[PDB]
Amino acid sequence: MAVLVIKLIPGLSGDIFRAAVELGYRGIVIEGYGAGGIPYRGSDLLQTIEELSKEIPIVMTTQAMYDGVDLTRYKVGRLALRAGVIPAGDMTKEATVTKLMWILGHTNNVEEIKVLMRKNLVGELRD
Amino acid sequence: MKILLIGMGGTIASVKGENGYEASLSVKEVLDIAGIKDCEDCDFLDLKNVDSTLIQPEDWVDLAETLYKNVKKYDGIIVTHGTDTLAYTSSMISFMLRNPPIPIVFTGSMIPATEENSDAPLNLQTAIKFATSGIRGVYVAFNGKVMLGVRTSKVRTMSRDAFESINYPIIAELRGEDLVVN
Ligand SMILES: N[C@@H](CC(=O)O)C(=O)O
């Protein structure tokens, strides 16, 4: 039920994400830019995630306040999907993190955690 | 008819004494300082009395259990909470207490019920009015609005209108003594 939430900034590297997983963090939320995505150059970030995404849930939400996320909208988004990133859709940041903690509270099957984060449990998400 | 008021603390319950020290009112006293005469047949239950910044995930398990054991006994529950993590709790409770049979309304205030021009009276009056509606589920009442608890975020830090429903319509808004749909 230990979750790390890190804000995406230009040039951020996957270094601290490897550290989190080593530290026993069971889930990670990334606050991306706009409609969501990952840089494919300038850092090891994308490769780091394509790696750890299969091992722990990696969720992407937006730094912006309104309108949420859509990883299909851009190639930067689509790549993050291909790397195994779980979109947060139109969820609030509070909903996204508590939803994750609650799910990790009784499962660790990344692939299952992923179908769950994409399902509207209690009115928190448009699915 | 029957409302339960659970207290968790926060600015709403705050009182600064003559010294660095900080004191907290109980949920019963908050209601009475806020000047709520309406609430009748209303019970009180003080779970915590802290600044919401201190809230841990275990605090949610406590709250969940309490709520789950009172949902059948009451027509409505109100939970007063500090604003810093109010939206964290409301979200989490929405997940834990899957299908609530009654309205459960989280509220708080940016200005302690103690002081003048406190937003406590409005928030509580709003929470109570919605606690007595027919509408089951988890909600936040703030600045005259009712918002789905799992779609609410704190958007302002030094301002009465501190909470908004994000990408989701307001459940109801106050308009005199009448709660209006959206
Ligand atoms: N720091 C306070 C802020 C408030 O309640 O307005 C708390 O969350 O307890």
Notes on the protein architecture:
- The complex is a heterodimer of chains A (127) and B (182).
- With 127 residues, chain A is an alpha/beta fold.
- Chain A has a single domain, classed as Rossmann fold.
- Chain A has 5 helices and 4 strands.
- A 4-stranded parallel beta sheet of chain A has the order 1-2-3-4, with helices on both faces.
- In chain A, helix 1 runs parallel beside helix 2.
- The longest helix of chain A has 12 residues, at 93-104.
- Chain A is globular and about 40 Å long.
- Chain B is an alpha/beta fold and 182 residues long.
- Chain B has one domain: 3-Layer(aba) Sandwich (Rossmann fold), CATH 3.40.50.1170.
- Helices cover 25% and strands 31% of the residues of chain B.
- Chain B contains 4 helices and 12 strands, in the order βββαβαβαβαββββββ.
- In chain B, strand 5, helix 3 (86-96) and strand 6 form a beta-alpha-beta unit.
- In chain B, helix 2 crosses helix 3.
- Chain B starts with a strand and ends with a strand.
- The interface between A and B is medium-sized, with 19 and 21 residues.
- The complex binds aspartic acid.
- Aspartic acid (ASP) is lined by residues 10-11, 51-53, 82-84, 108, 110 of chain B.
- The PDB classes it as hydrolase.
- Keywords: Hydrolase.
- The assembly is dimeric.
- The entry is titled "Crystal structure of Pyrococcus furiosus L-asparaginase with ligand".
Outline the secondary-structure elements.
The complex is a heterodimer of chains A (about 130) and B (about 180).
Chain A lengths: L2 E5 L7 H8 L4 E6 L12 H8 L5 E5 L12 H8 L3 E2 L5 H12 L5 H8 L10
Parallel strand pairs in A: 1-2, 2-3, 3-4
Helix pairs in contact in A: 1-2
Chain B lengths: L2 E7 L4 E3 L5 E3 L2 H8 L7 E9 L6 H14 L5 E5 L5 H11 L6 E5 L12 H12 L5 E6 L2 E4 L3 E3 L8 E3 L6 E4 L2 E4 L1
Parallel strand pairs in B: 1-4, 1-5, 5-6, 6-7
Antiparallel strand pairs in B: 2-3, 7-8, 8-11, 9-10, 11-12
Helix pairs in contact in B: 2-3
